[PDB]
Symmetry: D3
Subunit: 224 residues, 6 copies
């Protein structure tokens, strides 16, 4: 089942509860939270108290993407604030295996994020720790950027790795993609092998979230 994860980075921060409720009413499967500390990326967004404040409105799981360094303290705070999934960048933790283990020990699904330049081999020794891999199709920091075409090849490479792992372990690790996903390209991203699609500006930047998500669903029906 394909999952659509609207990114609140593009929402109206003066009415965040309404924005979350409205995108859930439109069919969102996850609420995607882009957490930036002004150090790992050149922008500062929102911390765990924002996650806690939205927990009563989030009848679907909250997916926290940590663009912060280091990561372990915010892993704990976001878990306590109600996150369901936490992902972080391997470059941002000296002890990646420990950080992934901590996410699961805090009760959350765990994942790693690949920047455009980050090789996929960074995943090969932590597959048993992973519930999801997020591939960035833009350079992290900002919404509204354009999908980097080479990401399709990386998605195919990750999918092949995860297909082989599922054959050995029986576990399916999810593939999420974040960056410039639009109705007009979502089918290509799914065809490359992804199953979870983060979109900010394409949804929140439009007047009718129901129409956008339905149009994305119709394109995904073509990829299937």
């Amino acid at each position: 089942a394909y999952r659509i994860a609207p990114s609140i980075l593009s929402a109206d921060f003066a009415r965040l509860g309404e924005e979350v409720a409205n995108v859930i009413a439109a069919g969102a499967d996850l609420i995607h939270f882009d957490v930036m500390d002004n150090h790992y990326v050149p922008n500062l967004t929102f911390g765990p108290m924002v996650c806690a404040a939205l927990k009563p409105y989030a009848s679907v799981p909250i997916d926290v993407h940590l663009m912060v360094e280091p990561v372990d303290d915010l892993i704990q705070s976001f878990a306590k604030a109600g996150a369901s999934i936490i992902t972080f960048h391997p470059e941002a933790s000296r002890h990646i295996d420990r950080s992934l283990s901590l996410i699961r020990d805090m009760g959350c699904q765990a994942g790693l994020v690949l920047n455009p330049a980050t090789p996929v081999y960074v995943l090969e020794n932590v597959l048993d720790r992973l519930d999801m891999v997020l591939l960035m199709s833009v350079n992290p920091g900002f919404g509204g950027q354009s999908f980097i075409p080479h990401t399709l090849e990386k998605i195919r490479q990750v999918r092949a790795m995860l297909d082989r792992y599922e054959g050995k372990s029986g576990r399916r690790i999810a593939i999420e993609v974040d960056g410039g996903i639009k109705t007009d390209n979502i089918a290509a991203v799914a065809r490359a092998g992804a199953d979870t699609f983060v979109a900010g500006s394409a949804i929140f930047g439009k007047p009718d979230y129901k129409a956008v998500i339905a149009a994305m669903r119709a394109e995904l029906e073509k990829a299937a």
Copy 2:
């Protein structure tokens, strides 16, 4: 005039526009923004896009307190997002004078923040750059903490320094205090020499912001 500056760190982040509108309806003079980057303090709060989103609701000035390091990039982005006042901690900038000058060059009032341990003498060479001094009466990072009594002596010391500076320059630098300010202690903070009072939990943690701010106003009349 005394200014009351409710701190949105204690507000409902799911309904921030309503919270800002309601505290302005209750008599807020400024909206206080506690910006934390998880490096200068052990907490992460909210960035310039939150300031920009609240600008249409803020009919009073936005007062941005940067608990971040370094500071110059966020000075620029908060100014562009509609901040009216920007303050930062001297320990967080290698070039304090440059950072204060940048705030004014971006169109904003500029200030420095003193942590509880920070000596007042860090202000003495930048008075011409300052519009406000913020004294922390708690260790920055968290709301709901208790006012540190020694802060009253520091407020008196800063007020004496700024009184002397006004005698020389004719310009009055404002004094703000942040940390554990409540109705039952606000008069003492004013008597020590402060004029702008940040309060988070005492306002946003209560059901009627109008009642709290009016009660603070009544205590300030005694100061």
Copy 3:
């Protein structure tokens, strides 16, 4: 009462329990622990597990001097390992007041350390948090260095500040000095106003700790 605090930085690390027992038998009032993380100073010494291992041998209080940055995690670990006093350098903590409060909340006496260049004014806003002030008479990092003569004036300045504070609060904050203290200069350090004296090479570098400490006591009787 004057306190002598032998510094284990100069002891035989292959027989640390014996060294602690022997210096206590010689009249030590405190065991001084110089903790260095290779970042705040250009040397690496010993961590909290060494403190824990010596706790059964330390029938006198353990005085931990943190030459580390940042400080709060090691404050907690050294307190849990049995430290009685913890001091740190104000330059090494972004939130000095918080760090001093944490030391006391962990059940320990709290202090700040002044490097040779550090002005005394850094103490003026945390006197209610302080149980001790340590003045370095050498640049931290190494034993066996020579006492910097200007330290005497700084000790006098701190003593005057603490005398005035005691007049207002009734609390006496202790003054410790660390760096090149020897039998031949300890009386001058006491005359300047200090009450607690750290010595490493002058004690542990000699064959008879009883003789050294007794000679220090005799010189301190002259300062009194």
Copy 4:
């Protein structure tokens, strides 16, 4: 020959010379030193002066594992303090080749350490600099943790790489493993291709080091 390298991280720091002498009497081939600076890992252990103090007791080589960042200053000081082998984490040095060269230029055998997540390919361009590769089977920082099963696959991968390198160069690079090694799993670690085994809690946490090391030797005979 298989080498057993007891880790003093788990020893009695009040009687370190006795501990070293006793584990050597029990058959230790190396004394393993876990050096932590509270920055590369969230723990602080012991510096070069502890190595120097143990040198007169160490009739077998001292194997220093640097969990520190940066590494070059401590490479030099541990070499001067009597280390025989020095290993460090590639992530902790901007110039890995330079750091490995420095270890050998100081008279020591040189190695790299792989954290559980670290890919083996980080070794492929420095084989001529290496005397040993250490694979962590736990996340570095603490003794007493449990062996991560995936480490066996990584050991096999490293052994295959080093077998190919020996075919080309004629030189055998040793493989060390550190983390949760016990009598009941040491044979599996050897079968995967390792030859040097670090153990802390399994040896120093037991009353008779001779019995533990002999029992490990008996299991290695089955490998």
Copy 5:
């Protein structure tokens, strides 16, 4: 077409314009600038104002190698100072793809640098961003060091990767090598697959730059 890129790190800094003019008169194809910030490498060299001052003398392109961290501010200032090519180390930028894009958006050719230990796979996801790959044959920081023999294998590996990419895209990415290149080894570097050769001490440390460059050209004609 082979390019020789004399490295001004080895030139007379009191007469830099003459040095640049003289090496161009000798046949230089590029002027190589080794920029060091004392943080990414343990040396400090020269900043963008030096590039700007040499722009009037550089009738051939200026090739800036950034051994600095972070990189984006200096990418911009070197581009504005007249650089034609800018390369940096992937380890020095958190967002490698962004930094490479910025170089091209500033009007320059973009490249990545591989330290001796750095795996070639760090290039595989940014080939569309690259105009050049620089392989260090010494540990960066200093001139006058000796060529690391394993570099030849890495050059071959990069050339195979770039050959496959040229077949897919039609774009040829250049391969530069820097570190201990001399007349007596330049042919072997070319045979391994490189096309651009940085040399400092071999050129500037000799009295006749024309003779050295001619001798290098003659060895390359044999390659």
Copy 6:
């Protein structure tokens, strides 16, 4: 005796030896070197190899101002490269007293630099270590900026402190000022208590260095 110290930050880096020779011919007493590592200040200038290259041209002492962090490695390399005076910022060294001692132990005169915001009290515990105090009259990083008027008060404060120290010790510590010094303001800087004057753009940005320095001398004779 007033000293004029032209700052090569404003010189023609393509002809640095000629620039140094020409400013010495014009009456320079020192050659001022503004060393920036892109970390302590947002600019990168020139390292010790540039100092070494100018040593044969510098018949007057070289005065190195380190705007770098940390400082001790560059203290050593600039001393070895021929510096006569080395100054650094107290905020840039964890162990200020050690760093000042190192400068003298390397054979150089030692000093501290005060940024515009830096309090003078940072000097009070190292007077025995100091040969010079430099007060910045601009925020460090760039030439061509405007003199900050409050610097005059700081100069007066430092001169009073140093006067008292000279009475106690018999040692006169020099006072240098750097930032926007021009012929039209140099007398006021001297009257405030300074004796050594760094000027970049006012000298090197003009066609006749002899005329500028002579004009500065004439204003100083009126001071």
